[PDB]
């Protein structure tokens, strides 16, 4: 019967370590997607923002949220599945109250790549050699008269514009500016070249090549 | 209360209150956790009633596709028969076939259902036999009838209508919204939402002004119109309709025939005078349509503007160019051209 | 046969709460896997102390080289071993059923099938692998036959011309054949 | 909490199940506030249309698609007629519910269920489905309630 | 079992279809994909080569086509000399059913229990959305194409084709008579039975009611 | 029926272009050109498109026929038909009221290793400028407008290529030119 | 109590033999044409067929000469403006709104009116009361006080009503 | 099939051609109803008087196909005398019902299947419709000419085609589907009594 | 303290039913057999295991009972051995029908011969179940 109620770090320190890894990550804040926005993703996310921003003290304790997905389409550049399920993760992730860090350990690729500009100025990481790229949205295959696909292409105009809107408050450009750059075909973006436009800021703190640390010990 | 732990999920949770989720496709692992459950909850006490929830598509797919077996809805049937503490059954979405048998097996006044719950009933189907011998068919013939048998008398008793009845309804898909299970036997109340939340969702539509300007009038004032001039484009062909009738009574009048004798003849010796029977065989009568309305006032319409007929009398010999070898069709003394 | 029967203090799963009490249910056919978890646990059973092993067989059939090597751990085991057979012991089952507690500790229920056969196999190749192979199962066919000879008593000779087919027996045949040596009852 | 938050993001399932989901938050005695992330498809809208008025929230992003129930059935002319006349009965019952969940006239709603309908959120809050703009406080408020 | 041929059993028993063209017969059945609006295309211009001033009949049973091989043949009827007459049988499946309508006029006819359709270009969106563009630039050129067509043979206005094409359309061949697509029905021996779809416009007038039905068949079960 | 016509020097190119089919093709012309040289054959393009390398076949044995090849497009001429169409004889190009011409590059790929995809990217890449340097010639429009156009996917009218310059001349004298 | 909605009150309850004709008689046209629903317009159906009946006899008093004539009038506009659509088969005749409170209307008349049992003019009394008679003979000015008055004078007792 | 079947059966299709005895075998796809109305067509360019007999033996079809074959039949010249052998079922029996009146045969050991279209509808609920309607034309279609040619009426044919309704040749004569059976004398085998 | 087998088995294997009727005979304690819906041959068998005199059927339950079946692939002489273990096994079976109906054991074979049903009162009027629920 008793509302049992979740106790945080401050005071659940003294219940020991928690058994698996994922439990782990999200008693650290960190919320990983490494694996493209399915409606799972979408589920398991929305579930630890709520759980985060549940019982927070001070929730200004940041969420980190390291990405290795290529988002909402598959690696063949056919869709894999929507636009909703971003929304639906990104929406969750702005009802919390802690600053939204973002990083890529690989790849973040045509939804992960905005939801990683979409963390907080000067603190976007990226692994040296993450590769990172802006395709416009993509659609899956339904049959029917022209207004069927007159209303996808609508739908579509209004995805590619909330990216656009997204990016342009990421990167402090021109919105129509930064739907002609990332969103009008499939651009690649090194390390060097997403922090050129800023999709990225930094790498992962504490980062030190080996034979750099050999040549300074 | 720290003794008994809080549940560890939700069938647990429900479970506690004595309620069956019956919520799967009548399968044998559904069935036998069923039967354990009901067992189970006789057993805790057999006074105190249990409440089942059915949101279930029998023993086949809603496709067509036969999943289970006629049986295990007997086996569910009967231990529902078995079980002796009271048993209310609220219909939940789905209640089809055997899941509607389930539905009608509680105890009786207090199965229900919720207002848009759909309960199907249809005749049992079985998965192709695999081109077996003459007896073998006759034999799995005599199988499936008697498990049809058994379905129809476990429906009859929830029901309370024939078995008859009951396999002539059946032959097709019977499909019921609670009005129509309530009717017919099925269920004996509906579920009626919440009397609080809906005056609540009235006043709020009012006092927030968005059921007044938001649209909707425009488009509510449009669908009264429209009903009211469908309802009088109906009511023009039904006029129509009447006017064709009495053309063919006005040309039908000129006429002589001995063939009305014979209908005399025919019919008993009570309706030797024209006595109807109570019947389908029902003569609605047109001519009478003396309304004398003085309320109904045709609008400020003109139909000045249709021509002057030349006026033509039929009391003439002149006849349509047609081909007829009847010989007995004389002129009569109203239609010399006949 | 899943529900977790209850133990000393607490729920445990059916057949860890058999092995809990020194009883191995085998039930498949012999295969890798099957054989695997048995040799493992008759390993680790006589581990715990050497006390015996019954071991109750529903064996269909199965493959030649886990059966060997299930009977070779069950013979290499410091804690004697009895065979029961409940249901049916067809094959290498009918093998097992022949490994276990010479001195009269295998028994069968009364409408147990038993059924014994030269130990099938298959295998191409070049010409000179087709010999090797050949000749390998020729030594299995042999090995298996001194083993259920010198278990029922028979003659090696006699099993090799009795087994070329199937054999089947019921539970009497079966002690008049020597394969078992006593039939369960309700005592 | 004399509130039940039901949190929608689904892009379709059969319209039966988002009729059995209104009814049942439509005869729980306690509220309930229903709120839209990303998508509300057939029966998510269902769903969404079917919590208590006035707490119905979608977020900016939000899209409500309804369509009419769309069904598949084989055999007999007169089997195929039979699930022709319950498809159109439930396609009225659709119809009717989201009538009376956002008081349009069923004409309006039986019009526009003729083809898939797509709603952004000030098109969704203007045709009644939902009811207010999800701002971040709502649910800061939300789950203080849960844990109030 | 696939199909059995007669050959006509002339001095060289040729193939029975071989025959029929020869006799300017040309049989369109299954999709008229692009193999078969090539085969139609050939036919009709070999028939015109050895004859061009003799009737072609065409035979058309066929459950629709590809929208470009459709109009290719389309096309080719239209680009050719001698007067080409359509005959429809079984069905016509909308995009077929353009070829019935382009018999030349007087010479268009149906069998009397075919199944005419008429539907807007169906076609299907998929990718990024300059692919969906495309799309939906090919189905309104194809229904523009189609519209004006349908327009060039029945004379229909563009209205009436907008609520003749919103959704399938299955018509009798009274529908196709009353609205153009075809001139002539092909009856029996003196058949003259009213099928359903004519029943209810009976009834939508007001000629028969559910008391007095007439000699119909009884459509009061709808 | 294919008989005469092949007779009265018509030859159909019809579906899919391939392989054999180009080979079957270029026969037929080689025929008709060794048969009799002063006297034109006409190519009829009813094509969705097909391989890059079967239909330069085709277009080198269209070029190499000393009789005047006229091509007749019906219906579809999509990416490699249209282009043959464009390689008629310059006047001698026609096409029906309401046939759709589309012009666009060709797809592929590579695998493995990815020197292989760098050969396979720089032999599409070949495929683009060698097809869109001819286009230019017979269509007489700037190359560079050349290569923007064989980049977007689109049809076009007979009405619209005959301005383009692919076509010259509309069977139906623009009376059914629907759009 | 709904109870009064049953078969006993229709056959139990002490009725004449007028009104319980008329109900037996609606009850009879509801199942004959197949739509087993009694409407109010059947009731009126009923009264006029009993041309015999004192409550069709007032209805002559009042103006309504043409009584078969009355019958088909009605009998034409319940096919017309209301209607005779055949359902499929209900087991039990269910009654309208209208008719199930004219047939508690009448009681409750007979009760004030002293006659121990349900009268066929406390019947068409209840019909006048709902409008019946007026929203079917609207040009013979035939209302529900009038028939009032016209049914005190013919059983000349004055009724008092809540 | 083995070839040597097929190539031995189109030589006696061939003969029989010539004898003018079009058949009707399996089910009447869209491909065998294109290949009858050609037959048809021919026979008819042929000889405009002689009969043809047609050979019925089918176990189903299409019913657009079957009424392509059904259209042609009744719009030819000579008359078409529909034979059934073995099994008109569901579409070849409605072909057999349409043959020239008086001139529809069977043997005695055949069964003539009747009933209602089967078919499927899918798409939402706005399609099933229009398909519903398509599948219900075509039952009232057929059940009117079954009227027609049976005598029977046609609420008695539509209760009677409601399920598969299996008939010997007897009782398709006492019913109407079919108007003679083709037997030829046999020996009345003496019983000792 | 008495074994309490519930039955609903639309089918199984034959051999499958003798198992489980040698096990239930094992246990000394009495076993209670209740059929519900079906009991086909092998969970007949099991519903003919059950005590004498504590073996229940319910009004609509259906009893299947047939002889055993089989495939058999091998040389002729394979086929004749497999065969002989079949015709043993539809002995076997006979024999326990006897026992529990106490019927002639040649009539209980005619009866296996085909598909064999039975309603609840014929099940209790063969010898399978004792009473109706």
């Known amino acids: 019967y008793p509302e049992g109620r979740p106790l945080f770090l401050p005071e659940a320190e003294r219940f020991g370590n928690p058994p698996d890894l994922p439990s782990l990550l999200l008693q650290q804040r960190v919320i990983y997607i490494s694996m493209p926005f399915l409606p799972s993703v979408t589920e398991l996310v929305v579930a630890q923002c709520y759980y985060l921003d549940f019982d927070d003290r001070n929730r200004q304790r940041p969420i980190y949220v390291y990405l290795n997905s290529t988002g909402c389409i598959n690696d063949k550049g056919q869709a894999i599945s929507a636009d909703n399920e971003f929304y639906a993760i990104w929406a969750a992730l702005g009802f919390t109250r802690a600053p939204l860090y973002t990083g890529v350990t690989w790849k973040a690729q045509n939804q992960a790549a905005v939801l990683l500009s979409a963390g907080q100025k000067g603190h976007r990481y990226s692994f040296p050699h993450a590769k990172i790229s802006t395709a416009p949205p993509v659609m899956n295959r339904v049959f029917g008269q022209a207004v069927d696909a007159q209303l996808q292409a609508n739908e579509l105009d209004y995805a590619t514009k909330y990216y656009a809107a997204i990016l342009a408050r990421s990167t402090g450009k021109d919105l129509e500016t930064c739907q002609k750059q990332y969103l009008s075909r499939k651009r690649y973006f090194s390390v060097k070249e997403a922090y050129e436009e800023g999709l990225v800021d930094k790498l992962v703190p504490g980062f030190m090549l080996n034979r750099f640390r050999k040549m300074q010990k | ?338 | ?187 | 909490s004399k509130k039940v938050f039901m949190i929608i993001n689904s892009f379709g399932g059969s319209v039966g199940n988002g009729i059995t989901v209104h009814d049942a938050l439509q005869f729980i005695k306690a509220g309930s506030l229903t709120l839209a992330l990303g998508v509300a498809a057939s029966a998510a809208s269902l769903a969404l249309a079917g919590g208590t008025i006035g707490e119905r929230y979608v977020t900016e992003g939000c899209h409500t698609m309804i369509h009419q129930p769309e069904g598949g059935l084989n055999g007999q002319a007169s089997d195929i007629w039979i699930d022709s006349q319950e498809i159109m009965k439930i396609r009225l019952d659709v119809a009717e519910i989201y009538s009376l969940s956002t008081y349009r006239p069923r004409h309006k709603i039986l019009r526009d269920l003729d083809r898939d309908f797509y709603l952004t959120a000030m098109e969704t809050i203007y045709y009644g489905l939902a009811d207010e703009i999800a701002t971040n406080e709502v649910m800061h408020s939300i789950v203080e309630m849960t844990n109030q | ?222 | 029926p294919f008989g005469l016509l092949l007779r009265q020097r018509i030859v159909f190119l019809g579906g899919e272009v391939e392989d054999f089919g180009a080979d079957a093709i270029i026969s037929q012309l080689l025929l008709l050109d060794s048969q009799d040289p002063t006297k034109d054959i006409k190519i009829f393009i009813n094509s969705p498109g097909g391989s890059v390398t079967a239909g330069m076949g085709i277009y080198d044995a269209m070029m190499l026929c000393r009789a005047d090849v006229n091509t007749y497009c019906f219906g579809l001429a999509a990416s490699m038909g249209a282009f043959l169409l464009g390689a008629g004889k310059r006047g001698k190009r026609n096409s029906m009221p309401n046939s759709r011409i589309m012009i666009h590059q060709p797809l592929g790929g590579a695998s493995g290793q990815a020197v292989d995809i760098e050969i396979q990217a720089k032999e599409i890449m070949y495929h683009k400028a060698n097809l869109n340097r001819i286009m230019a010639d017979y269509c007489q429009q700037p190359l560079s407008k050349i290569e923007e156009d064989t980049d977007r996917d689109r049809y076009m009218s007979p009405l619209e290529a005959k301005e383009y310059g692919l076509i010259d001349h509309i069977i139906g004298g623009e009376e059914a030119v629907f759009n | 109590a709904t109870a009064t909605a049953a078969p006993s009150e229709l056959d139990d309850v002490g009725v004449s033999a007028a009104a319980e004709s008329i109900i037996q008689y609606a009850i009879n046209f509801a199942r004959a044409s197949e739509t087993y629903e009694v409407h109010s317009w059947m009731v009126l159906m009923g009264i006029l067929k009993y041309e015999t009946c004192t409550a069709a006899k007032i209805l002559k008093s009042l103006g309504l000469e043409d009584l078969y004539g009355a019958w088909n009038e009605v009998l034409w506009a319940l096919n017309v403006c209301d209607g005779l659509q055949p359902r499929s088969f209900v087991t039990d005749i269910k009654f309208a709104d209208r008719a199930f409170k004219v047939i508690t209307a009448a009681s409750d008349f007979a009760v004030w009116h002293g006659k121990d049992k349900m009268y066929s003019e406390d019947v068409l009394m209840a019909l006048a009361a709902g409008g019946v008679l007026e929203d079917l003979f609207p040009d013979l000015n035939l209302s529900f006080e009038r028939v009032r008055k016209a049914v005190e004078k013919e059983s000349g007792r004055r009724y008092q009503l809540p | ?193």
């Open chain 3, 1 to 187: 046969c899943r529900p977790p029967g209850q133990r000393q203090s607490e729920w445990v799963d059916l057949w860890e709460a058999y092995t809990y009490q020194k009883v191995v249910f085998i039930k498949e056919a012999i295969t890798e896997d099957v054989a695997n978890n048995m040799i493992a646990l008759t390993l680790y059973l006589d581990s715990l102390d050497q006390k015996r092993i019954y071991y109750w067989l529903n064996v269909p059939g199965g493959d030649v080289v886990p059966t060997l090597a299930l009977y070779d751990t069950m013979q290499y085991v410091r804690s004697k071993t009895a065979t029961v057979c409940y249901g049916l012991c067809l094959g290498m089952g009918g093998f097992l059923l022949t490994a276990g507690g010479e001195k009269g500790y295998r028994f069968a229920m009364p409408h147990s099938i038993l059924m014994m056969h030269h130990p099938s196999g298959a295998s191409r190749g070049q010409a000179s692998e087709m010999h090797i192979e050949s000749r390998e199962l020729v030594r299995m066919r042999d090995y298996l036959s001194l083993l259920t000879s010198n278990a029922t008593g028979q003659p090696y000779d006699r099993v090799i011309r009795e087994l070329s087919r199937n054999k089947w027996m019921d539970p009497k045949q079966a002690i008049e054949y020597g394969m078992i040596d006593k039939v369960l009852t309700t005592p």
């Open chain 2, 1 to 338: 209360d720290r003794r008994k732990p809080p549940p560890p999920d939700l069938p647990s949770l429900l479970f506690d209150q004595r309620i069956v989720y019956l919520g799967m496709p009548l399968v044998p692992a559904v069935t036998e956790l069923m039967v354990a459950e009901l067992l189970y909850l006789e057993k805790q006490g057999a006074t105190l009633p249990i409440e089942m929830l059915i949101n279930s598509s029998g023993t086949t797919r809603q496709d067509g596709e036969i999943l289970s077996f006629d049986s295990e809805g007997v086996a569910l049937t009967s231990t529902m028969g078995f079980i002796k503490n009271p048993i209310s059954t609220v219909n939940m979405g789905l209640a089809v076939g055997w899941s509607c048998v389930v539905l009608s097996f509680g105890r009786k006044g207090w199965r229900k259902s919720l207002p848009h719950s759909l309960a199907m009933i249809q005749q049992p189907r079985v998965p192709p036999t695999g081109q077996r011998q003459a007896i073998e068919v006759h034999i799995k013939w005599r199988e499936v009838l008697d498990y049809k048998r058994e379905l129809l008398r476990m429906f009859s008793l929830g029901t309370g209508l024939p078995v008859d009845k009951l396999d002539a309804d059946m032959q097709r898909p019977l499909y019921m919204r609670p009005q129509d299970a309530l009717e017919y036997g099925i269920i004996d109340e509906i579920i009626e939402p919440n009397e609080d939340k809906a005056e609540k969702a009235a006043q709020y539509w009012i006092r927030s002004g968005r059921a007044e300007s938001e649209g909707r009038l425009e488009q509510w004032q449009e669908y009264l119109s429209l009903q009211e001039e469908y309802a009088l484009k109906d009511s023009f062909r039904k006029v129509m309709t009447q006017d064709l009738r009495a053309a063919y009574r006005d040309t039908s009048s000129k006429l002589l025939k001995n063939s009305s004798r014979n209908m005399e003849q025919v019919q008993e010796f009570k309706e030797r005078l024209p006595d109807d029977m109570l019947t389908e065989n029902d003569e609605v009568r047109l001519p009478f349509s003396r309304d004398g309305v003085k309320l109904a006032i045709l609008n400020a319409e003109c139909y000045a503007e249709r021509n002057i007929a030349r006026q033509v009398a039929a009391n003439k010999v002149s006849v349509p160019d047609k081909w007829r070898a009847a010989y007995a069709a004389r002129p009569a003394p109203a239609a010399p051209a006949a």
């Open chain 5, 1 to 222: 079992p696939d199909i059995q041929i007669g050959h006509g059993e002339d001095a060289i028993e040729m193939d029975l279809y071989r025959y029929l063209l020869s006799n300017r017969i040309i049989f369109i059945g299954g999709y008229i994909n692009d193999k078969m609006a090539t085969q139609i295309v050939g036919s009709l211009m070999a028939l015109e080569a050895v004859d061009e001033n003799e009737d072609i009949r065409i035979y058309i049973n066929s459950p629709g086509g590809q929208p470009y091989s459709v109009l290719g043949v389309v096309d080719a009827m239209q680009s050719i000399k001698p007067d080409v007459q359509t005959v429809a049988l079984g069905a016509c499946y909308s995009y077929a059913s353009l070829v019935v309508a382009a018999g030349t006029k007087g010479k268009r006819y149906a069998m009397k229990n075919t199944r005419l359709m008429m539907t807007q270009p169906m076609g299907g969106s998929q990718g990024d959305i300059y692919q969906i563009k495309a799309t939906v630039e090919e189905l309104n050129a194809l229904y523009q194409i189609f519209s004006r067509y349908y327009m060039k043979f029945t004379g229909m206005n563009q209205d009436q084709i907008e609520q003749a094409t919103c959704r399938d359309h299955f018509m009798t061949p009274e529908q196709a008579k009353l609205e153009g697509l075809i001139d002539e029905i092909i009856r029996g021996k003196g058949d003259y039975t009213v099928p359903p779809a004519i029943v209810r416009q009976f009834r939508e007038v007001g000629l028969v009611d559910d008391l007095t039905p007439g000699p119909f068949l009884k459509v009061d079960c709808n």
């Open chain 8, 1 to 193: 099939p083995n070839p040597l079947v097929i190539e031995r059966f189109q030589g006696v299709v061939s003969q029989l051609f010539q004898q003018r005895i079009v058949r009707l075998g399996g089910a009447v796809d869209d491909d065998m109803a294109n290949l009858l109305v050609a037959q048809l067509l021919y026979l008819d360019s042929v000889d405009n008087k002689r009969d043809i007999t047609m050979y019925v033996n089918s176990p189903g079809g299409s019913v657009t196909a079957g009424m392509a074959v059904f259209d042609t039949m009744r719009h030819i010249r000579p008359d078409v005398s529909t034979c059934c052998i073995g099994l008109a079922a569901s579409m070849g029996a409605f072909i057999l019902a349409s043959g020239q009146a008086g001139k529809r045969y069977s043997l005695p050991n055949s069964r003539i299947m009747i009933h209602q279209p089967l078919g499927g509808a899918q798409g939402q609920a706005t399609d099933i419709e229009i398909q519903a309607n398509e599948i219900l034309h075509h039952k009232l279609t057929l059940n009117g000419y079954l009227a027609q040619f049976t005598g029977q009426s046609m609420e008695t044919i539509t209760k009677d085609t409601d399920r598969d309704f299996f008939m010997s040749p007897q009782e398709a004569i006492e019913y109407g589907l079919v108007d003679a059976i083709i037997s030829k004398p046999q020996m009345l085998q003496s019983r000792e009594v």
